[PDB]
Assembly symmetry: C3
Homo-oligomer: 258 residues x 3
């Protein structure tokens, strides 16, 4: 399959196309809004938190460009027994075996989610040890999930990588729910943290669910539905999450200064 | 050549399959042990050393799964003049030109090795400059080793990359043997450091040798033995190494405190 | 299109081959020269700058080896509307459609440019916030540049990434020209920083110009000429830039010794 065919496949499919191009527009508009909102920051620690946050939609716009252009999408055949094995996709007038694997999402999450975690950790006044733990295991979760999506030799290996990824995820969840909830009180950011933490935990839990229900998993959701589900999660987990963090940050630059 | 053909290819050859699936379980079992061993730590600095150390077997289980699943393995045709050139593999009933390239190892080494170094550097009370130097050259060592294995155009190029990788390695060896060995004194970990240090250097020194002997080098060793050589080296350079460091840490948390 | 075909295409193409092999040599000689020059450094901060600087030619030799070997080169077909669409390369013995894409340059810039910036920011006495910002957007610039060259589906998509990459570039430019220019005055390195600042801004502006003029862009410059333009830029932006920064550092260790 050609990159252009996958690019044409995205266009031609209103559902799939809208899920991608809307976030290219939204992520781009977010970057511009966030830069305008924080233009007045003077404190370097507050600025560090703002840059880290702004990088979230910066990575997002590139991720969606990679997906919509076909650069980071592949057509893969599922292993023996996989709920979607034997499926076909059809590019233009031709029909090919396999499923539309949008691995570009999983790959870029390894870049954007560490930035969400770094911004949140700093906001909560975390120490280096916890930031390092959250971030490394977070990256490990994103990479093993990518590996699971790219494995086509065995149906079991796929879910095994999915398990490894879930294990790394509980670590991140633990420091978010336990560790940082405490740190935030000592930092004077318990209020905004509890909000972002609640949002983060609930929205993030959605990704592995969507993964299991879409073509990658048990395939009960079509490609266009699974994509909008992720694009919807991103809109909250990234764009509104960042708007709320930066909205607070610009009104509380002094508290975050340290 | 599909991923499916490489997966089962690991089978039908218990010599190769064992070296892989065995470390998957040893890595996982090591992770469990370490987590319960370090349940007592409370010092943020001692906690850093532990997490850094625990990540080694974490990257290892994923690395072996990538290899075992056929995800990070390929069949490459060696260049003219290469000893393994003109070889076949046959992923089943059909035989194809090339050799079984397990690049999956070299790729993850750029992730695991930096963590081993992070742990050691912290133990010795190293400063940032030395940590930065060790980790950057260690990563360069791994990536060029990976490039060496993927180069199929020229035999001399493969060896040129090998040479570059060796130059980066001496940089790591130098900080281990000369720099940190001295920092460990001011940190008060010279004792445990010398131990881990001696272990690390001897074990790492074997990876390039294995590479040179395996199918990607002179090809005197079979993919099964080379895989076991590495698999054996990891058990020491990673798991047992992690245990020694962690064992010390749990018993001497106040030594590496400074928090 | 095999790696070998690419490796042989470079050879038998004097322009292209010379733009690659010459810098494998210049990078290597630069590494030796810089190590020799910095031998007497003792302050940890002074040595951080030096190591960060030396890593520039280390990444560079590996980059050029990757290109000369054919490992990081590919033949791609340009999208409709591209002034290089439907082009032929005549690779090996048979004419092949597409353009020789040396994407290995963009891939390694993501590793080398952050080191140039770390060295400069340190030289200017930058806080961690500006260093984080400069380096992350620099990496974003490089990765989206690589994505642009790797995009064959749409012509518009290629220039859009180029646009995103440019946006990231202005952040780096602003930090160099606005932020660090003022910081260097407090760090007592105003003179040398302003010099390296300018050399850097001028040479870096050269890369997107070459990208746009070369085969990746409007194609007014054939592959061998686009390659020499990049190789000429690297000699100034990397090797002589590093030579000048180290020349200053070794005569002013105390000025940047700080902590
Ligand atoms: C808006 C935007 C993109 C919009 C896209 C749109 C609308 C696409 C529409 C597509 C359509 C309709 C498609 C239709 C299809 C076919 C249609 C057809 C006609 C063909 O048929 C169909 C029908 C579905 O099939 C991008 C912005 C993109 C924006 C970018 C790339 C911005 C970059 C900014 C940066 C990078 C600033 C950074 C600033 C910083 C880091 C500032 C720093 C300060 C701190 C500085 C310090 C510390 C260094 O001193 C701070 C205080 C934090 O601000
Ligand atoms: C146990 C495990 C895996 C076990 C696997 C086994 C037994 C596999 C067996 C396979 C077989 C027999 C195959 C046979 C083949 C048949 C093949 C065929 C296809 C036919 O079937 C045949 C026959 C040869 O051919 C994994 C764990 C995997 C575990 C993972 C991925 C864990 C992640 C979590 C961590 C590492 C927590 C970390 C917690 C930390 C760092 C907590 C923090 C504390 C500090 C707190 C702070 C910093 C947050 O404040 C600290 C003190 C550091 O602990
Ligand atoms: C010189 C060199 C290479 C030269 C290559 C040449 C000339 C190639 C020529 C090719 C030709 C002509 C080809 C022709 C083709 C065919 C021709 C034919 C005839 C065959 O037909 C044709 C015609 C085009 O088609 C490499 C060096 C290569 C060098 C390397 C790889 C060096 C590594 C060193 C390190 C990594 C040290 C590092 C030291 C450090 C970091 C020291 C640290 C100090 C601080 C210490 C601390 C922090 C640890 O405490 C410090 C102060 C920073 O120095
Ligand atoms: C973050 C995102 C948004 C930015 C984009 C970067 C990266 C994800 C793009 C890599 C894309 C490829 C895997 C795409 C496959 C396209 C196929 C359907 C077509 C193959 O047909 C093309 C062949 C011709 O020979 O070229 C064969 C060569 C082709 C061109 C593949 C070359 C692949 C190399 C091995 C991959 C490089 C990837 C980078 C190391 C990734 C991340 C780096 C970090 C620092 C951000
Ligand atoms: C890290 C360890 C512990 C876990 C391992 C996970 C991961 C690193 C493995 C990725 C595997 C692939 C490179 C395997 C290629 C196998 C080929 C022989 C078959 C390709 O057939 C698939 C084609 C169909 O077109 O898809 C074309 C797309 C194919 C699948 C290539 C996709 C390549 C992307 C661009 C590479 C992503 C790698 C990450 C950048 C590595 C590290 C990232 C850091 C920031 C954590
Ligand atoms: C560190 C600095 C100093 C040194 C820089 C050196 C750099 C130039 C080398 C990196 C080179 C690789 C990206 C090359 C891949 C070449 C491919 C286009 C063609 C492979 O041809 C083989 C096919 C056969 O089918 O397998 C198709 C599948 C193949 C085998 C997959 C290869 C996948 C690789 C392992 C993907 C990981 C790439 C790393 C994330 C890149 C940079 C990492 C940073 C953190 C150092
Ligand atoms: C901007 C993107 C965000 C916030 C992405 C978040 C992604 C996750 C929390 C993904 C988790 C997964 C698992 C826990 C199991 C395996 C599969 C994944 C990758 C979907
Ligand atoms: C867990 C894995 C470990 C500790 C791996 C260590 C690997 C090395 C020290 C590899 C070194 C190599 C060279 C010095 C030369 C070229 C080839 C390599 C990659 C095998
Ligand atoms: C050693 C390499 C150096 C100094 C490389 C510098 C590269 C740039 C400044 C590249 C910038 C680019 C853009 C701003 C737009 C898109 C294309 C690029 C990647 C050429
Ligand atoms: Cl600042
Ligand atoms: Cl993303
Ligand atoms: Cl802690
Ligand atoms: Cl590993
Ligand atoms: Cl030092
Ligand atoms: Cl480079």
């Amino acid at each position: 399959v050609t990159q252009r065919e996958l690019f044409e496949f995205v266009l031609n499919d209103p559902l799939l196309a809208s899920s991608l191009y809307i976030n290219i527009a939204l992520a781009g508009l977010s970057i511009l809004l966030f830069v305008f909102m924080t233009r007045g920051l003077d404190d370097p620690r507050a600025k560090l938190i703002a840059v880290s946050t702004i990088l979230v939609p910066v990575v997002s716009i590139a991720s969606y460009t990679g997906l919509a252009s076909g650069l980071t999408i592949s057509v893969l055949e599922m292993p023996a027994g996989h709920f979607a094995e034997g499926s076909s996709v059809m590019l233009g007038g031709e029909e090919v075996d396999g499923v539309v694997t949008m691995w570009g999402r999983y790959l870029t999450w390894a870049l954007s989610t560490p930035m969400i975690l770094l911004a949140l950790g700093l906001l909560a006044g975390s120490n280096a040890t916890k930031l390092f733990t959250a971030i490394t295991f977070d990256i490990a979760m994103c990479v093993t999930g990518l590996a699971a999506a790219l494995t086509t030799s065995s149906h079991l290996m796929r879910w095994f990588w999915y398990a490894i990824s879930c294990a790394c995820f509980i670590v991140v969840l633990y420091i978010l729910l336990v560790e940082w909830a405490q740190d935030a009180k000592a930092a004077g950011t318990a209020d905004i943290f509890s909000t972002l933490k609640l949002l983060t935990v609930v929205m993030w839990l959605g990704y592995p669910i969507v993964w299991a229900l879409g073509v990658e998993g048990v395939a009960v959701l079509p490609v266009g539905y699974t994509s909008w589900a992720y694009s919807a999660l991103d809109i909250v987990a990234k764009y509104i999450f960042a708007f709320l963090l930066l909205n607070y940050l610009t009104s509380n630059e002094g508290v975050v200064s340290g």
